[PDB]
Swiss-Prot record, chain A:
Upper classification of the organism: Bacteria, Bacillati, Bacillota, Bacilli, Lactobacillales
A GO molecular function held by the record: ribosomal small subunit binding
Gene Ontology biological process terms, A to Z: negative regulation of translational elongation
Quaternary structure note: Interacts with 100S ribosomes.
Keyword Cytoplasm: yes
Family: Belongs to the HPF/YfiA ribosome-associated protein family. Long HPF subfamily.
Keywords, ordered alphabetically: Cytoplasm, Translation regulation
This protein's record includes keyword Cytoplasm: yes
GO cellular component, one term: cytosolic small ribosomal subunit
Localisation: Cytoplasm
Function: Required for dimerization of active 70S ribosomes into 100S ribosomes in stationary phase; 100S ribosomes are translationally inactive and sometimes present during exponential growth.
Protein's gene: hpf
Main location class: cytoplasm
Official protein name in the record: Ribosome hibernation promotion factor
Species name: Streptococcus pyogenes serotype M6 (strain ATCC BAA-946 / MGAS10394)
Swiss-Prot record, chain B:
Gene: hpf
Entry's localization field: Cytoplasm
Designated name of the protein: Ribosome hibernation promotion factor
Function: Required for dimerization of active 70S ribosomes into 100S ribosomes in stationary phase; 100S ribosomes are translationally inactive and sometimes present during exponential growth.
UniProt record similarity statement: Belongs to the HPF/YfiA ribosome-associated protein family. Long HPF subfamily.
Subunit relationships: Interacts with 100S ribosomes.
Amino acid sequence: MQVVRTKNVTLKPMDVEEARLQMELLGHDFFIYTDSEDGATNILYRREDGNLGLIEAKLE
Amino acid sequence: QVVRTKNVTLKPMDVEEARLQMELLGHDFFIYTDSEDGATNILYRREDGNLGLIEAKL
């Protein structure tokens, strides 16, 4: 079978500039946090483009 | 420089259902709510090609 190793992380509030900083200090391609102003769950991620992409996960 | 957000609506499901979704959308990752603990999850393809998961929670 296929085993997916889980990496547990605790969601925290911060600026998207902060998320970028922290993501890079780990070289991760994915950084999930809760937007400091908006309050919603955000996922900063590096596109195949190389550029950054920001996803907002609607708790809807 | 300037980036526009993308909106996604999370749904509860297990890693298997999420894995199938990711394949269908032909995407490299998938975000959903873990139906076991209600956490926000990110199933994704690692560099080595393997599958990894990130579980976020307050």
